[PDB]
Amino acid sequence: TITDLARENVRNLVWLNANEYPTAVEFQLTQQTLNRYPECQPKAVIENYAQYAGVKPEQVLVSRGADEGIELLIRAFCEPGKDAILYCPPTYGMYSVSAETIGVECRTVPTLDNWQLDLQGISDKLDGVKVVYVCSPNNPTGQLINPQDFRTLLELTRGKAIVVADEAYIEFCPQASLAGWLAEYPHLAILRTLSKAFALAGLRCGFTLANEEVINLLMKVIAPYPLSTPVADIAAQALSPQGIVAMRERVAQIIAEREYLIAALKEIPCVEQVFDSETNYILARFKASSAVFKSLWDQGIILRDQNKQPSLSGCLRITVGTREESQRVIDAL
């Protein structure tokens, strides 16, 4: 049959649940040139993003979301069946998914009790690893990785593996970005997106920030015209000075609402513990989380269960929405 021909690995492969900005920001097309193929790397988007991130244009690569960026790094550096990828659970699921789909080995070193890196465990499992992913701030936990530890991770992998900092939520704590470290570390790569703070998840637009040599290797493995013209168009508009300003206003409004939500949740009986976050979502441990999860779910309040993630039993991840959405969750709880 048909499935027997498939690769073995392939044969076995209120909305507050996806970390999206709660409100739609309107945009309209300005470039009616849809009959022609777009440029491989839209100049307007790349230059606007480089100014925003404070890096050189030659250190930026635009792709179909940060998700494509994760895949590209594996495609360029890992030899299937020979090389490995390393990540530290509980974290973003796409790292393992892309590697498993591609047929590359996954090495996992779970983080310590406070979600920080187990530097000793990592140094013991580096042999044969080509790419290390580290999400900071981490999804779903919400916290930043100590920069001192990132320095250690960078020293450990110097000339052995590429270290990828997933900064999908860096807009909520801009001061913590490692974008300024590129000059010191040739093997450091950073993933950025327009899907979260930028309120543009529907666009599927992301970026990889790395030194020119890395960017050039990634250009060799990326699809010929990765971005559509309508996406490049809207993206350049959102990356304009006025757009960066409107973005910052969105972040500020989300942080204020996040602080209200944390304060209120800490007063609710069933809520055992609320963890600090530097993002647009809150991880909280509940007494009988599955019961509470199904209850809200039936009420039409959709969260994200994390009960099955390593060390997250009892936890649910709540995305920060509007004041009215927060009130619905509080009242419901």
Residue numbers of the site for ligand PLP (CB under 6 A)? 19, 65-67, 92, 135, 139, 166, 168, 193, 195-196, 201, 206
Q: Whole-angstrom Cα distance, residue 213 to residue 12?
A: 36
Q: Whole-angstrom Cα distance, residue 180 to residue 176?
A: 10
Pick 117 or 292: Cβ nearer ligand PLP? 117
Nearest Cα to 49, choosing from 64, 38, 58, 60?
Answer: 60
In the complex, minimum distance from the CB of residue 283 to a copy of itself, in angstroms, rounded to a whole number:
20
Q: Which does 263 bind (CB under 5 to 8 A by kind): a copy of itself, ligand PLP, none?
A: none
How many residues are recorded in the chain?
333
Nearest Cα to 87, choosing from 165, 199, 198?
Answer: 165
Instruction: Please give the structure tokens belonging to residue 127.
Output: 């042999």
Query: Exposed (0-12), middle (13-18) or buried (19+): which is 78, by Cβ within 10 Å?
Result: buried
In the complex, minimum distance from the CB of residue 198 to a copy of itself, in angstroms, rounded to a whole number:
9
Q: Whole-angstrom Cα distance, residue 287 to residue 305?
A: 13
| Residue 329 Cα to chain centre, angstroms | 25
Q: Which does 217 bind (CB under 5 to 8 A by kind): ligand PLP, a copy of itself, none?
A: a copy of itself
Pick 92 or 292: Cβ nearer ligand PLP? 92
Q: Which does 80 bind (CB under 5 to 8 A by kind): ligand PLP, a copy of itself, none?
A: a copy of itself
Torsion of CA 33, 35, 41, 44, to 10 degrees: 0
Pick 94 or 261: Cβ nearer ligand PLP? 94
Query: Exposed (0-12), middle (13-18) or buried (19+): which is 16, by Cβ within 10 Å?
Result: buried
Q: Which residue is nearest to ligand PLP (CB)?
A: 65
In the complex, minimum distance from the CB of residue 92 to ligand PLP, in angstroms, rounded to a whole number:
4
Instruction: Please give the structure tokens belonging to residue 38.
Output: 């777009």
Q: Which does 5 bind (CB under 5 to 8 A by kind): ligand PLP, a copy of itself, none?
A: a copy of itself
In the complex, minimum distance from the CB of residue 69 to ligand PLP, in angstroms, rounded to a whole number:
8
Pick 44 or 201: Cβ nearer ligand PLP? 201
Q: Which does 101 bind (CB under 5 to 8 A by kind): a copy of itself, ligand PLP, none?
A: a copy of itself
Q: Which does 34 bind (CB under 5 to 8 A by kind): a copy of itself, ligand PLP, none?
A: a copy of itself
Q: Whole-angstrom Cα distance, residue 124 to residue 109?
A: 9
In the complex, minimum distance from the CB of residue 213 to a copy of itself, in angstroms, rounded to a whole number:
5
In the complex, minimum distance from the CB of residue 26 to a copy of itself, in angstroms, rounded to a whole number:
5
Q: What is the DSSP code (8-state) at residue 114?
A: T
